[PDB]
Tab-separated table of N, CA and C in Angstrom:
chain	number	residue	atom	x	y	z
A	1	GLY	N	13.038	9.147	5.643
A	1	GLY	CA	13.166	7.716	5.901
A	1	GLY	C	11.655	6.738	4.382
A	2	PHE	N	11.209	8.005	4.164
A	2	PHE	CA	10.588	7.470	2.664
A	2	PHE	C	11.689	7.419	1.802
A	3	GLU	N	12.676	8.183	1.888
A	3	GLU	CA	13.481	8.075	0.588
A	3	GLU	C	14.453	6.256	0.725
A	4	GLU	N	14.630	6.160	1.751
A	4	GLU	CA	14.988	4.720	1.791
A	4	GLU	C	14.248	3.383	1.648
A	5	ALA	N	13.127	3.976	2.151
A	5	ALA	CA	12.036	3.062	1.918
A	5	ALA	C	11.647	2.823	0.582
A	6	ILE	N	12.020	4.061	-0.465
A	6	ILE	CA	11.787	3.648	-1.707
A	6	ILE	C	13.018	2.751	-2.181
A	7	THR	N	14.374	3.094	-2.185
A	7	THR	CA	15.582	2.137	-2.488
A	7	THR	C	15.221	0.804	-2.212
A	8	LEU	N	14.877	0.399	-0.266
A	8	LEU	CA	14.377	-1.469	-0.619
A	8	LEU	C	13.695	-1.529	-1.290
A	9	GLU	N	12.661	-0.737	-2.329
A	9	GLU	CA	12.064	-1.638	-2.775
A	9	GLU	C	12.551	-1.360	-3.924
A	10	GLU	N	13.856	-0.917	-4.666
A	10	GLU	CA	14.034	-1.005	-5.712
A	10	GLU	C	14.833	-2.528	-5.809
A	11	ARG	N	15.694	-2.403	-4.282
A	11	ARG	CA	16.070	-3.967	-4.045
A	11	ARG	C	16.044	-4.655	-4.506
A	12	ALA	N	14.282	-4.703	-3.575
A	12	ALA	CA	13.642	-6.019	-4.129
A	12	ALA	C	12.631	-6.659	-5.367
A	13	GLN	N	13.103	-5.489	-6.027
A	13	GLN	CA	11.514	-5.529	-7.335
A	13	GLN	C	13.665	-6.175	-7.867
A	14	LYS	N	15.091	-5.530	-8.020
A	14	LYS	CA	16.265	-6.155	-8.866
A	14	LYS	C	16.291	-7.270	-8.049
A	15	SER	N	16.280	-8.175	-6.936
A	15	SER	CA	16.120	-9.562	-6.364
A	15	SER	C	14.836	-10.079	-7.175
A	16	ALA	N	14.135	-10.150	-7.594
A	16	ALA	CA	12.985	-10.390	-8.052
A	16	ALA	C	13.937	-10.681	-9.506
A	17	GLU	N	14.129	-9.230	-10.715
A	17	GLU	CA	14.307	-9.768	-11.724
A	17	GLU	C	15.357	-10.996	-11.562
A	18	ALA	N	16.599	-11.326	-10.473
A	18	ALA	CA	17.598	-12.252	-10.382
A	18	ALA	C	16.862	-13.179	-10.169
A	19	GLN	N	15.803	-13.316	-10.322
A	19	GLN	CA	15.387	-15.201	-9.593
A	19	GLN	C	15.493	-16.034	-11.186
A	20	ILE	N	14.996	-15.384	-11.802
A	20	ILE	CA	15.761	-15.598	-13.373
A	20	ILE	C	16.974	-16.843	-13.459
A	21	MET	N	18.504	-15.920	-13.631
A	21	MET	CA	19.388	-16.519	-13.264
A	21	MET	C	19.401	-17.630	-11.945
A	22	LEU	N	18.856	-17.713	-10.900
A	22	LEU	CA	18.963	-18.689	-10.243
A	22	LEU	C	18.542	-19.925	-10.728
A	23	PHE	N	16.283	-19.646	-11.413
A	23	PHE	CA	17.100	-20.984	-12.239
A	23	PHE	C	17.789	-21.678	-13.188
A	24	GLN	N	18.440	-20.954	-14.122
A	24	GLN	CA	19.152	-21.142	-14.958
A	24	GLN	C	20.328	-21.673	-14.181
A	25	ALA	N	20.803	-21.074	-12.644
A	25	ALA	CA	21.656	-21.828	-12.583
A	25	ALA	C	21.912	-23.033	-12.124
A	26	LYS	N	20.313	-23.164	-11.110
A	26	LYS	CA	19.857	-24.392	-11.285
A	26	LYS	C	19.624	-25.879	-12.417
A	27	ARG	N	19.498	-25.033	-13.462
A	27	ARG	CA	19.200	-26.030	-14.282
A	27	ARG	C	20.626	-26.383	-15.366
A	28	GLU	N	21.996	-24.859	-15.353
A	28	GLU	CA	22.846	-25.322	-14.985
A	28	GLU	C	23.597	-26.991	-13.632
A	29	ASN	N	22.717	-26.706	-12.655
A	29	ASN	CA	23.623	-27.033	-12.071
A	29	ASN	C	23.082	-29.137	-11.992
A	30	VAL	N	21.585	-28.595	-12.911
A	30	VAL	CA	21.954	-30.218	-13.321
A	30	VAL	C	22.610	-30.841	-14.215
A	31	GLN	N	22.478	-30.582	-15.369
A	31	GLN	CA	23.279	-30.600	-16.394
A	31	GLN	C	24.533	-30.764	-16.235
A	32	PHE	N	25.161	-29.855	-15.085
A	32	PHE	CA	26.681	-30.217	-14.373
A	32	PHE	C	26.508	-32.092	-13.899
A	33	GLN	N	26.020	-32.198	-13.057
A	33	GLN	CA	25.602	-33.504	-12.493
A	33	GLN	C	25.799	-34.717	-13.576
A	34	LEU	N	24.510	-34.381	-14.436
A	34	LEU	CA	24.455	-35.422	-15.648
A	34	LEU	C	25.513	-35.588	-16.291
A	35	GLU	N	26.381	-34.615	-16.033
A	35	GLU	CA	27.893	-34.749	-17.376
A	35	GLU	C	28.521	-35.074	-16.079
A	36	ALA	N	28.956	-35.122	-15.270
A	36	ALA	CA	29.903	-35.514	-14.397
A	36	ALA	C	30.029	-37.133	-13.987
A	37	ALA	N	28.044	-37.437	-13.889
A	37	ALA	CA	28.163	-38.891	-14.046
A	37	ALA	C	28.268	-39.939	-15.283
A	38	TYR	N	27.877	-38.694	-16.272
A	38	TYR	CA	28.249	-39.537	-17.569
A	38	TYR	C	29.060	-40.022	-18.359
A	39	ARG	N	30.474	-38.641	-18.275
A	39	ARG	CA	31.417	-38.813	-17.743
A	39	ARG	C	32.835	-39.434	-17.608
A	40	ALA	N	32.166	-40.120	-16.406
A	40	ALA	CA	32.632	-40.764	-15.827
A	40	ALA	C	32.796	-42.471	-16.148
A	41	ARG	N	31.571	-42.095	-16.687
A	41	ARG	CA	31.365	-44.017	-17.364
A	41	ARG	C	31.953	-43.734	-18.322
A	42	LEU	N	32.088	-42.926	-19.059
A	42	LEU	CA	33.145	-43.307	-20.275
A	42	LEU	C	34.477	-42.973	-19.906
A	43	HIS	N	34.878	-42.339	-18.998
A	43	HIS	CA	36.455	-42.559	-17.812
A	43	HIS	C	36.907	-44.147	-17.798
A	44	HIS	N	35.339	-44.668	-16.982
A	44	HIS	CA	35.902	-45.778	-16.425
A	44	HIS	C	35.575	-47.141	-17.610
A	45	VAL	N	34.888	-46.920	-18.768
A	45	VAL	CA	34.632	-47.647	-19.482
A	45	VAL	C	36.275	-47.485	-20.716
A	46	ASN	N	36.765	-46.417	-21.153
A	46	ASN	CA	38.190	-46.328	-21.125
A	46	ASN	C	39.515	-47.173	-20.201
A	47	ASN	N	39.432	-46.923	-19.199
A	47	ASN	CA	39.923	-47.592	-17.923
A	47	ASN	C	39.888	-49.670	-17.855
A	48	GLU	N	38.343	-49.481	-18.052
A	48	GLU	CA	37.980	-50.852	-18.016
A	48	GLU	C	38.422	-51.637	-19.399
A	49	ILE	N	38.633	-50.909	-20.664
A	49	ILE	CA	39.554	-51.294	-21.884
A	49	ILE	C	40.892	-51.597	-21.543
A	50	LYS	N	41.336	-50.776	-20.694
A	50	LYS	CA	43.301	-50.273	-21.283
A	50	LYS	C	43.151	-51.448	-19.477
A	51	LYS	N	42.140	-51.850	-18.726
A	51	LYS	CA	42.434	-53.950	-17.870
A	51	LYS	C	42.574	-54.386	-18.710
A	52	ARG	N	41.309	-54.372	-19.311
A	52	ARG	CA	41.907	-55.902	-20.511
A	52	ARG	C	42.810	-56.264	-21.289
A	53	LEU	N	42.915	-54.720	-21.762
A	53	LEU	CA	44.353	-54.607	-22.336
A	53	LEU	C	45.437	-55.379	-21.598
B	1	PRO	N	-26.009	37.828	49.348
B	1	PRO	CA	-25.792	36.835	48.511
B	1	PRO	C	-25.222	35.873	48.416
B	2	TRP	N	-24.649	35.068	49.394
B	2	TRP	CA	-24.040	34.211	49.104
B	2	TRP	C	-24.180	32.951	47.537
B	3	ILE	N	-25.605	32.776	47.481
B	3	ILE	CA	-25.381	31.546	46.273
B	3	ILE	C	-24.855	32.033	44.988
B	4	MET	N	-25.332	33.641	44.734
B	4	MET	CA	-25.300	33.887	43.370
B	4	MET	C	-23.683	34.400	42.815
B	5	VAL	N	-22.700	34.566	43.906
B	5	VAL	CA	-21.202	34.547	44.611
B	5	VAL	C	-20.731	33.508	44.083
B	6	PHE	N	-21.517	32.447	45.166
B	6	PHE	CA	-20.687	30.986	45.047
B	6	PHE	C	-21.047	30.595	43.626
B	7	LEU	N	-21.760	30.271	42.693
B	7	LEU	CA	-22.268	29.844	41.298
B	7	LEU	C	-21.444	30.862	40.684
B	8	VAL	N	-20.838	32.240	40.311
B	8	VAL	CA	-19.517	32.215	39.589
B	8	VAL	C	-18.828	31.898	39.961
B	9	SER	N	-18.443	31.330	41.521
B	9	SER	CA	-16.830	30.825	41.671
B	9	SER	C	-16.360	29.396	41.419
B	10	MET	N	-18.142	28.963	41.042
B	10	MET	CA	-18.103	28.023	40.732
B	10	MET	C	-18.189	27.837	38.689
B	11	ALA	N	-18.364	28.547	37.995
B	11	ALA	CA	-18.037	28.463	37.062
B	11	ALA	C	-17.164	29.791	36.934
B	12	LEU	N	-16.653	30.805	37.279
B	12	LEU	CA	-14.847	30.767	36.980
B	12	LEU	C	-13.920	29.223	36.935
B	13	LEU	N	-14.330	28.424	37.894
B	13	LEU	CA	-13.296	26.946	38.438
B	13	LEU	C	-13.551	26.342	37.480
B	14	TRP	N	-14.804	26.198	37.072
B	14	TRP	CA	-15.401	25.303	35.460
B	14	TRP	C	-14.071	25.471	34.309
B	15	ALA	N	-14.542	26.895	34.046
B	15	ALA	CA	-13.892	27.814	33.386
B	15	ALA	C	-12.602	27.654	32.849
B	16	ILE	N	-12.338	27.590	34.163
B	16	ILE	CA	-10.271	27.723	34.009
B	16	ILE	C	-9.749	25.448	34.209
B	17	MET	N	-10.582	25.550	34.667
B	17	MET	CA	-10.676	23.969	33.956
B	17	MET	C	-10.170	23.502	32.720
B	18	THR	N	-11.335	24.269	32.258
B	18	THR	CA	-11.412	23.543	30.226
B	18	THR	C	-10.376	24.099	30.207
B	19	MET	N	-10.012	25.253	30.102
B	19	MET	CA	-8.967	26.541	29.460
B	19	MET	C	-7.505	25.387	30.002
B	20	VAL	N	-7.076	24.955	31.388
B	20	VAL	CA	-6.159	23.688	31.781
B	20	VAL	C	-5.765	22.968	30.823
B	21	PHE	N	-7.124	22.369	30.333
B	21	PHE	CA	-7.650	20.668	29.348
B	21	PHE	C	-6.561	21.587	28.837
B	22	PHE	N	-7.686	22.125	27.674
B	22	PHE	CA	-6.628	22.607	26.087
B	22	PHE	C	-5.318	23.251	25.787
B	23	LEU	N	-4.871	23.598	27.317
B	23	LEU	CA	-3.902	23.667	26.949
B	23	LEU	C	-2.192	23.011	27.465
B	24	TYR	N	-1.632	22.310	26.428
B	24	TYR	CA	-0.618	21.849	25.770
B	24	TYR	C	-0.242	22.003	24.879
B	25	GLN	N	0.799	21.460	24.651
B	25	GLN	CA	1.364	21.473	22.375
B	25	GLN	C	1.657	20.232	22.504
B	26	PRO	N	0.967	19.967	21.256
B	26	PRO	CA	1.014	18.945	20.390
B	26	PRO	C	2.234	18.242	19.745
B	27	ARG	N	2.888	16.999	19.652
B	27	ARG	CA	3.572	16.937	18.460
B	27	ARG	C	3.640	16.019	18.431
B	28	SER	N	4.544	15.939	16.946
B	28	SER	CA	4.155	14.895	15.651
B	28	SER	C	5.898	14.127	15.741
B	29	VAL	N	6.067	12.664	16.726
B	29	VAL	CA	7.706	12.544	17.464
B	29	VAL	C	7.478	11.076	16.528
B	30	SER	N	6.443	11.074	14.952
B	30	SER	CA	5.914	8.964	14.443
B	30	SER	C	6.809	9.560	12.952
B	31	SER	N	8.324	9.098	13.289
B	31	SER	CA	9.000	9.304	11.918
B	31	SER	C	9.005	8.458	11.174
B	32	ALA	N	9.722	7.982	9.969
B	32	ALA	CA	9.463	6.931	9.273
B	32	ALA	C	10.713	5.925	9.500
B	33	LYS	N	10.718	5.261	10.672
B	33	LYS	CA	11.411	4.257	10.806
B	33	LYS	C	11.726	3.165	11.104
B	34	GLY	N	10.038	3.066	11.096
B	34	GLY	CA	9.688	1.556	11.158
B	34	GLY	C	9.252	1.203	9.798
B	35	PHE	N	9.462	2.472	8.578
B	35	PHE	CA	9.303	2.025	7.283
B	35	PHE	C	10.592	2.112	6.769
B	36	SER	N	11.356	1.160	8.202
B	36	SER	CA	12.669	0.577	7.077
B	36	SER	C	12.724	-0.532	7.769
B	37	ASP	N	11.662	-0.909	8.183
B	37	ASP	CA	12.343	-2.037	9.058
B	37	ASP	C	11.324	-2.988	7.986
B	38	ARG	N	10.321	-2.722	7.519
B	38	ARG	CA	9.287	-3.669	6.633
B	38	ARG	C	9.498	-4.216	5.267
B	39	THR	N	11.117	-4.068	5.739
B	39	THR	CA	11.698	-4.789	3.866
B	39	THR	C	11.120	-5.356	3.181
B	40	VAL	N	10.015	-5.643	2.604
B	40	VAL	CA	9.357	-7.208	2.070
B	40	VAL	C	10.275	-7.399	0.999
B	41	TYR	N	10.385	-9.007	1.167
B	41	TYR	CA	10.821	-9.644	0.300
B	41	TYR	C	10.779	-10.926	-0.006
B	42	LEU	N	11.475	-10.782	-1.629
B	42	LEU	CA	10.937	-12.055	-2.631
B	42	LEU	C	11.747	-13.342	-1.653
B	43	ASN	N	10.824	-14.593	-1.746
B	43	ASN	CA	11.529	-15.894	-1.195
B	43	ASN	C	12.165	-16.769	-2.613
B	44	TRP	N	13.071	-17.173	-2.693
B	44	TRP	CA	13.755	-16.906	-4.240
B	44	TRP	C	13.563	-19.321	-4.267
B	45	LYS	N	13.074	-19.675	-4.559
B	45	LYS	CA	12.538	-20.733	-5.379
B	45	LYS	C	13.984	-21.315	-5.005
B	46	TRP	N	14.657	-22.167	-4.197
B	46	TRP	CA	15.659	-23.176	-4.515
B	46	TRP	C	15.263	-24.543	-4.804
């Protein structure tokens, strides 16, 4: 039981280490949304010019 | 001498009673099973 409790604490420390990559995933999630919104407008502008043509 | 015989018998009864009181088997049956249920885990900043 003491050996198992050590390994459980080892996993808890590793999950604390992976908190940083979660933050990067949140940062990329924000950047993905801003890209999908801005590029659709760029697609919409191109479609509007094609509509004018 | 009934008084002296009574006192010895009662003193014997007290001595047998004390010997019975410590006549037992201690056990240690508290393992670390509850330690395995104390997995402290960090709340993630969602």
